[PDB]
Amino acid sequence: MATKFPKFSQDLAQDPTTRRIWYGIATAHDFETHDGMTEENLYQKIFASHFGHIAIIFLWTSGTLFHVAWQGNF
């Protein structure tokens, strides 16, 4: 049997308690411990995560600019 989430940890997916939920959130970014992680896939996933983070910073900055323009008194 398996409860699917989290897909990256059968030791957690087979936890029949609420811990499975909590730890699933706590170990998602620790890519090194995902089941069957390789160094190359580790680096590539980190690369894409960096891209997403840069997009997030740009979106937050755009939010600052847009809200100042729209609802400000600049």
Partner 1 sequence: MDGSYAASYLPWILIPMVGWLFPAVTMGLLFIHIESEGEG
Partner 2 sequence: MALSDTQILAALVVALLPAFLAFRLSTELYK
Binding-site ranges for partner 2 (CB under 8 A): 7, 45, 48-49, 51-52, 55, 59, 66, 69-70
Does the protein bind ligand CLA through residue 27 (CB under 6 A)?
A: yes
Both tokens of residue 16? 């029949």
Q: Which ranges in 1-74 belong to alpha helices (H)?
A: 10-13, 19-26, 39-71
Does the protein bind ligand CLA through residue 54 (CB under 6 A)?
A: no
Which lies closer to partner 1 via its Cβ, residue 29 or residue 50? 29
Both tokens of residue 18? 């609420």
End-to-end CA distance of the chain: 60
User: Which residues of the shown chain bind partner 1 in the complex (CB under 8 A)?
Assistant: 1-5, 21, 24, 70-71
